[PDB]
Amino acid sequence: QSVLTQPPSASGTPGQRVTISCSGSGSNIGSNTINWYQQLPGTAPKVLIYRNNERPSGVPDRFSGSKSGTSASLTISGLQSEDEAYYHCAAWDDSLNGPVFGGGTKLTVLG
Template identity: 55%
Template sequence: MALCALPLCLLGLFLAGSCAQHVVTQPPSVSGSPGQTVKLSCSVSGGYSISSYGIGWYQQTPGNPPRYLLYYFSDSSTGRGTGVPDRFSGSASGSVGYLTISGLQAEDDADYYCLTWDNSAKMLTVV
């Protein structure tokens, strides 16, 4: 039985802080087949540590506003949005945050945004 590939388009954000600008980079797309596990990455420049500031993930399907999925600071500090299944999970290593989607489903075909912040941030610019 053939399975259709599900492109998962990723977009980046820039975080403009009071002293420095952290550039957030995501790969242009990730593909997977139904039932597979995919791992989306979000890399932050400038020596930024995900475990110090955290990372959030949003999902957007055509014609709908972004849906909050989860935030991740550490294995002991994470949380999901209302109704988000536990097959969506977060993790991080240094300056790279990850969103893992287990048991990929057709409805997971969407744009995924990562968002990060720090306490000195004054402005958030979306590209």
């Protein structure tokens, strides 16, 4: 139902790199930066990436974000057991003149 579309659940082996996609139009993705939030199951969401390039110090280097035109990709990388979380892509929207968010992807840690 969200304006920004994300995969429902992406899984990967521990150590592997997992890519989460966020697709939309240039009004909110092209015109405004994409950011990625993560919330662990049962916990309040913590900032992962904001403005696509900087991170809040604690985040390890594996988490990176890229924005190309109307698309965005967050390569989580270095999959660990605690990666399992809901991932949301967020951006300002000029048509709605407010924050809009993605559908959310459930990261899964495989055996």
